[PDB]
Design a protein around this ligand. Structure first.
Ligand code: K3V
Ligand code: K3V
Ligand code: CL
Ligand code: MG
Ligand code: MG
Ligand code: MG
Ligand code: MG
Lengths: 194, 194
């Protein structure tokens, strides 16, 4: 019933562009929308986000998260490890790579989502969510070596999976940080389950 | 360590603007970023709300109520939590209950309200509150719910059992071209992982 008629470029940066989208509404009426896109898409999706499940025997299972300054937010955010997919990289491979660069951990793929949208009333940005387990008792994950690219400055924060929502709430109250909506959604559902 | 030095408008639409952001990196060097913001945010603690609506009914499994709409930025149909912007002076809770009733017909009860969480913080400053609401589906109010959709709003309701949410979503993606929202997918994944 609805579809895109045309897209008019408004402004194109190096990394992000802004378009005016014309579309057909279901009544037969032509309407416009302001849409954002990345200039970097190639690929199945723009990026990946990694759900990294740190598994150490006789310890609580942890979700590994990252804390970074985010210029669009003007502040620090707590997020799943994440980056753009290199041209000719599988989502799985982008996941293990971004997890290593950001956390130093070496992980194993558990499952991989279809492409899923980030904020579809604003942008066409999509990611694959990739669930990865980390054998925290293996020697390669003993002293994890985080390999930042240029301009990445990442702090690693591991939180117990069984208390994740309360732990995130605590960081927000004490540390004046913003939690990512996907991380919060995950945490909420761990509480809502059964 | 890191902070914003300047925010230069690049291009301003009616709804969305693009900025050149200058910030201080943790080495003490000046860097830039391209940043998206909405033009509609005022004194609200966030741009919007998304609603996790738990539909509860005697001798029924709980359902998660979702919505399907055409999203012009995406060029197609998306499945998402009911959601909308917070009106000036409106509380996040009120906005959630309002959007839920407008998009689904259901009258909910507030359960919990998150702090402001970031939608895509490498791109935009956009934030929402995630508001968990229960819907008493035994109540006459919620018997034959009809959406009160706004002008240009065209929303289909899809209620899926919480206990099988991820597979049910996969079965919808398998049957037509549509994108699941990353918050929905994350929430469904944690239901599985729990
Ligand atoms: C009914 O409200 C709207 C009308 C046009 C637009 C256009 N571009 N983006 C929006 O987000 C938008 C919107 O939603 C805030
Ligand atoms: C380290 O790579 C980058 C350098 C500058 C930028 C600037 N604006 N947006 C980005 O998303 C971005 C980026 O990440 C894709
Ligand atoms: Cl797992
Ligand atoms: Mg990253
Ligand atoms: Mg990275
Ligand atoms: Mg909406
Ligand atoms: Mg609405």
């Amino acid at each position: 019933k609805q579809y895109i008629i045309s897209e008019e470029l408004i402004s194109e940066g190096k990394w992000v562009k802004l378009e005016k989208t014309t579309y057909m509404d279901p009544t037969g009426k032509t309407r416009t929308w302001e849409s954002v896109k990345r200039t970097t898409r190639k690929q199945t999706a723009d990026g990946v986000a990694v759900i990294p499940v740190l598994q150490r025997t006789l310890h609580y299972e942890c979700i590994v998260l990252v804390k970074q300054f985010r210029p669009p937010m003007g502040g620090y955010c707590i997020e799943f490890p994440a980056g753009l997919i290199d041209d000719g990289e599988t989502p799985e491979a982008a996941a293990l790579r971004e997890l290593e660069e950001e956390t130093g951990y070496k992980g194993d793929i558990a499952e991989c989502s279809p492409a899923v949208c980030m904020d579809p009333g604003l942008s066409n940005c999509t990611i694959h969510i990739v669930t990865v387990t980390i054998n925290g008792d293996d020697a390669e994950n003993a002293r994890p070596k985080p390999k930042p690219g240029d301009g990445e400055f990442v702090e690693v924060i591991s939180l117990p999976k069984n208390d994740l929502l309360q732990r995130l709430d605590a960081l927000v109250a004490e540390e004046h940080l913003t939690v990512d909506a996907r991380v919060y959604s995950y945490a909420l559902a761990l509480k809502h389950a059964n």
